[PDB]
């Protein structure tokens, strides 16, 4: 039964069970939030008082009818959120007076269309439109987006699109990021043609692409702005690849493809037209696949029908998709590949030995095999010798057996991430060449390791009673060595760390006894710059940058 | 046992200084070359003498004249070629395997070795009757190695093997298996072959050699060790065994070899109770995984174990199988294993320990139609109960469920087999506990040890009326009085119920985040 507020002017009337817009509103209010109530009705005078309001958040209340002129006096309002209400239909009158509006979210309302009069023509300041719904938004007409020339974010949620009039999205000159939700492919070809010259990033959501057929577009030779293409929750078949790949012929400038929580009801039996395979995926440098569900993942094909298509790509991500082998021939065909991220898969040295064959991944500089099932650092590093250009490896989140004294690694490996790796000792396995080492979140009792070049040394969340000798790394730049078991570090330790420029010590059971905590106490002060995280005194909570001693 | 171990001591003679009444002496792995009487005369009490891995050329059994008590002599891995014909009657274990004997050194006097139980031999030539002198002893192991053996003038060599519990045969470790000796056996409990290298060209050579050691009186076990073989040949090896009297078949350190194609096979009535494969290296990378996995899936035995391999999956049997035991330890299996598999309705115990099972709720949907499942060990995987779709469909029949050592959170109690009796959830990540721990009232053992639990909602362990074991240790319990009372009154009222990280009664086991004080010590008024 209470509306609050704050000094700035940010009133918060959230889940107080209202049946009407809170009585008495002030011209001091800059941001009103009346979400999640039963404001079934907004009336003529309900919002005349707060004429200086920049933000009106009415999300998911119970709003089913809003008088036409409800918003007339809100002429400074830039953020309007009516999502998730029972607006059975929309009025052209609500938005006319809001010449200051930048953001307007209308999704979540049971309207069938956007009504018979353009809603947005007089909104020269609009940057973000969100319309549509899951179960009833069914038509898209050419009037619907008249008067809109540019938008940062357009989000049409049209899962139930029964009909899309030709050329609806074409009048819009520039769209920075269009998010479409279609349940099936019936209109994708038609809409894709309308956004060839406007959209800069297309995100397609929740689409059954199972039986998607391509065919040449009516459109004229228009150079497309589109640089990113992303499929969120799509169902795809091996056929879909063959057709979808044909779309890139219209978006020559494209440089990134992404597939998110997508299902592939297939096995990689791709047969790409030959025109497309000569193109080598155009200007697409980066390909990203996350959580691709493949029902019979184990029956997956050679994937050799695309070995030529991908000779030019530079960054590939295939995360949490049950990858268990990148066939050697594939690897040798990924000539131009610089970044490879195979996190959260099924790689084991046995497969990795094939996937990194003698001629594999020639340009690879970064390998990421986090959260796979590796169990021997010696076997791993030795397999990877095939990678001559490898300069940074991440085999973290892999429950390794104890590393030995003698290992080999890529002679240019400057970055090794062994975090969360279960280890409890560090031997001379780790190569001297290492400029960055991350051995945090483990069971290390002592880091006692000569690594000259070593700049950074992330080694937090450990059981380290004692701090490492400052000779072990003469050119050191950083040392994240928090959440540890440090009682107190020897006075005169950052002497030969004439290089250290940032440090971590927080969350640590120390010992702030005036007779002993001399050095630390005053060094942390001289260079408060070189330091993030505030050291907690054991039992006091008082910072170590505090009181010094005579 | 009164022992002196002098192995790797670089020795040359038998240390004349040793304690006179010594009983077990090992001079293994040295450079002793001759063994004269005055070398061991004094050790009158000697029972055991291990001389494995030396350089002795001749061995005179009279040399042991004064060791009337010697029962274990191991002169394997030397360079023996000559041998006194009469071994000491005191022998129970005589090992002469891996030497340089032309022909089996078993003389007629070996009959006097009535107490003999282990016999180890090696040779390069075999005649049918060579082991006749020991055919009337109640032997337990005959170790025999054909490392020294080459093929000869086609006139097939024979060799009658005396009745033994175990027959262990070791071959040359660096070549295609090429034995043509005809080996008979009457009574055999366990045949065991080591160092088997096959392609398709010598596959049959092995099947023939096995044919006669395998002809059956009763049942016997077979063990293959270090087999590197074609896939074609492996599918043959299985088929060769199926009709034969082999109850347990075991394979250790298998290496699949040149290609994996679809091979012909049918499994008919068999004596086989158990296939067990452990440690599988695979050198083929491109092949139809059906061609490999179906060969096992369609097997009509009761127990299949396949462990420590690169395998990523197992196919669901095409027809109702008779598997009642499945153990796929330490592979790379996923939660899609046996998805909606309605053809393991006899399966009682399934073991998926040490794999890549991700989605705890997919792992529940797996057992949906496993009408006989009582034990499910999906431990040491990568499980977690954060699934978007948290729908439960457990087999109503599970009694023992090892979920220990994953990344399970607390929602894990929203979804547990109706009639569970054992629930090992140790080494997980549970703080998040729900009010569903009493809608599952039949447990007897419980292990929520090594977790992240601070407190436990008041009134759980009350309805766990059948509880009797509970591992509460290694948890960061909040011991501030307003809410640590319930657990303290509990541990005390049930002192015997709480076990430790070892297995014995211990109410101390539960400790506090701060002092380390036993939670049952605390008194909140």
């Amino acid at each position: 039964e209470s509306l609050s507020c704050d000094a700035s002017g940010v009133c918060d009337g959230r889940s107080r069970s209202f049946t009407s817009i809170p009585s008495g509103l002030t011209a001091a209010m800059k941001s009103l939030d009346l979400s999640f109530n039963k404001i079934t009705y907004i009336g003529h005078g309900d919002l005349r008082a707060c004429a200086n309001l920049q933000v009106l958040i009415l999300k998911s209340s119970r709003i089913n009818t809003i008088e036409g002129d409800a918003f007339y006096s809100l002429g400074s309002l830039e953020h309007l959120d009516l999502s998730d209400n029972h607006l059975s239909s929309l009025s052209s009158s609500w938005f006319g007076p809001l010449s200051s509006l930048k953001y307007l979210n209308l999704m979540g309302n049971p309207y069938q269309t956007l009504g018979v009069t353009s809603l947005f023509p007089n909104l020269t300041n609009l940057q973000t439109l969100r319309i549509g719904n899951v179960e009833t938004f069914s038509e898209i007409r050419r009037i619907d987006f008249a008067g809109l020339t540019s938008l940062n974010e357009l989000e049409i949620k049209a899962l139930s699109l029964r009909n899309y009039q030709s050329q609806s999205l074409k009048s819009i000159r520039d769209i920075h990021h269009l998010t479409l939700h279609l349940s099936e492919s019936a209109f994708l070809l038609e809409i894709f043609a309308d956004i060839l010259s406007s959209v800069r990033y297309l995100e397609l959501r929740d689409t059954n692409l199972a039986r998607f057929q391509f065919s040449p577009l009516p459109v004229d030779e228009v150079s497309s702005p589109m640089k990113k293409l992303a499929f969120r929750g799509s169902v795809l078949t091996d056929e879909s690849f063959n057709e979808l790949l044909k779309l890139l012929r219209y978006i020559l400038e494209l440089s990134e493809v992404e597939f998110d929580d997508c299902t592939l009801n297939g096995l990689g039996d791709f047969n790409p037209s030959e025109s497309d395979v000569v193109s080598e995926l155009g200007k697409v440098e980066t390909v990203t696949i996350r959580r691709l569900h493949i029902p019979q993942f184990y029956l997956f094909y050679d994937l050799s029908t695309v070995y030529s298509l991908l000779e030019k790509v530079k960054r590939i991500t295939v995360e949490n998709s049950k990858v268990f082998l990148v066939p050697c021939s594939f690897s040798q065909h990924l000539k131009s590949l610089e970044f490879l991220d195979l996190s959260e898969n099924l790689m084991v040295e046995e497969y990795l030995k094939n996937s990194a064959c003698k001629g594999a991944w020639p340009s690879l500089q970064t390998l990421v095999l986090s959260q796979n099932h590796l169990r021997s650092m010696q076997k791993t590093g030795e397999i990877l010798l095939t990678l001559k250009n490898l300069t940074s490896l991440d085999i973290s989140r892999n429950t390794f057996h104890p590393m030995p004294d003698s290992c080999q690694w890529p002679e240019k490996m400057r970055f090794l991430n062994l975090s969360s790796t279960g280890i409890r000792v560090v031997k001379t396995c780790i190569p001297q060449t290492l400029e960055v080492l991350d051995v945090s979140n483990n069971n290390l009792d002592s880091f006692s390791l000569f690594l000259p070049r070593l700049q950074e040394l992330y080694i937090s969340r450990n059981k380290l009673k004692t701090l490492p000798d400052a000779s072990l790394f003469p050119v050191l730049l950083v040392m994240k060595i928090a959440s540890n078991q440090l009682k107190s570090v020897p006075d005169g330790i950052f002497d030969r760390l004439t290089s250290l420029q940032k440090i971590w010590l927080h969350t640590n059971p120390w010992d702030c006894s005036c007779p002993r905590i001399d050095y630390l106490s005053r060094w942390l002060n001289k260079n408060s710059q070189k330091e993030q995280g505030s050291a907690k005194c054991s039992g006091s909570g008082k910072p170590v940058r505090s009181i010094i001693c005579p | 046992e009164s022992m002196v171990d002098y192995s790797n001591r670089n020795l040359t003679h038998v240390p004349k200084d040793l304690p006179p009444r010594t009983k077990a002496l090992s001079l293994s792995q040295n450079s002793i070359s001759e063994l004269r009487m005055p070398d061991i005369s004094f050790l009158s009490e000697l029972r055991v003498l291990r001389l494995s891995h030396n350089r002795i050329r001749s061995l005179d059994f009279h040399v042991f004249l004064f060791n009337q008590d010697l029962e274990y002599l191991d002169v394997s891995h030397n360079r023996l070629q000559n041998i006194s014909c009469c071994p000491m009657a005191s022998l129970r274990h005589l090992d002469l395997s891996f030497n340089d004997f032309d022909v089996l050194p078993v003389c007629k006097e070996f009959g006097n070795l009535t107490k003999l139980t282990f016999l180890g031999l090696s040779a390069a030539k075999f005649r049918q009757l060579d082991l006749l002198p020991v055919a009337h002893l109640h032997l337990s192991c005959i170790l025999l190695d054909l490392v020294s053996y080459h093929i000869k003038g086609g006139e097939t060599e024979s060799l009658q093997i005396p009745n033994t519990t175990v027959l262990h045969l070791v071959f040359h470790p660096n070549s295609l298996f090429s034995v043509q000796v005809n080996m008979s056996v009457n009574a055999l409990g366990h045949l065991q072959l080591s160092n088997i290298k096959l392609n398709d060209e010598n596959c049959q050579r092995l099947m023939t050699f096995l044919s006669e050691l395998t002809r059956g009186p009763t049942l016997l076990n077979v063990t293959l060790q270090h087999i590197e073989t074609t896939w074609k040949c492996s599918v043959k090896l299985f088929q060769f065994f199926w009709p034969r009297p082999v109850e347990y078949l075991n394979i250790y350190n298998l290496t699949i070899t040149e290609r994996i194609d679809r091979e012909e096979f049918t499994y008919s009535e068999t004596a086989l109770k158990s296939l067990m494969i452990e440690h599988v290296k695979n050198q083929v990378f491109l092949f139809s995984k059906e061609a490999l996995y179906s060969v096992f899936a369609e097997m009509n035995i009761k127990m299949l174990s396949i462990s420590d391999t690169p395998f990523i999956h197992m196919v669901c049997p095409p027809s109702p199988s008779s598997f009642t035991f499945l153990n796929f330890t330490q592979n790379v299996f996923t939660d899609s294993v046996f998805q909606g598999c309605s053809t393991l309705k006899r399966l009682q115990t399934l073991i998926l320990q040490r794999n890549g099972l991700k989605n705890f709720f997919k792992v529940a949907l797996m057992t949906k139609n496993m009408s006989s499942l009582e034990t499910l060990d999906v431990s040491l995987n990568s499980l977690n109960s954060h699934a978007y779709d948290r729908t439960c469909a457990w087999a109503e029949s599970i009694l023992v469920l090892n979920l220990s050592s994953n990344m399970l959170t607390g929602s894990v109690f929203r979804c547990l087999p109706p009639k569970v009796k054992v629930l090992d959830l140790h080494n997980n990540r549970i703080m998040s506990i729900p009010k569903d721990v009493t809608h599952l009232q039949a447990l007897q053992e419980l292990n929520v040890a090594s977790n992240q639990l601070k407190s436990v909602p008041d009134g759980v362990f009350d309805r766990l009326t059948s509880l009797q074991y509970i591992w509460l240790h290694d948890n960061p319990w909040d011991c501030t009085c307003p809410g640590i009372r319930y657990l303290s009154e509990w541990i005390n009222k049930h002192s015997g119920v709480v076990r430790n990280s070892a297995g014995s009664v211990a109410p101390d086991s539960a400790k506090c985040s701060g002092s380390g004080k036993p939670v049952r010590s605390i008194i909140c008024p």
């Binding site: 990689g268 039996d269 029956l299 997956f300 094909y301 050679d302 994937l303 050799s304 082998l325 066939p327 | 990378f285 491109l286 092949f287 139809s288 995984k289």
Partner: peptide, 6 residues
Amino acid sequence: CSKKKK
């Protein structure tokens, strides 16, 4: 992985 059907 598997090769095709030739």
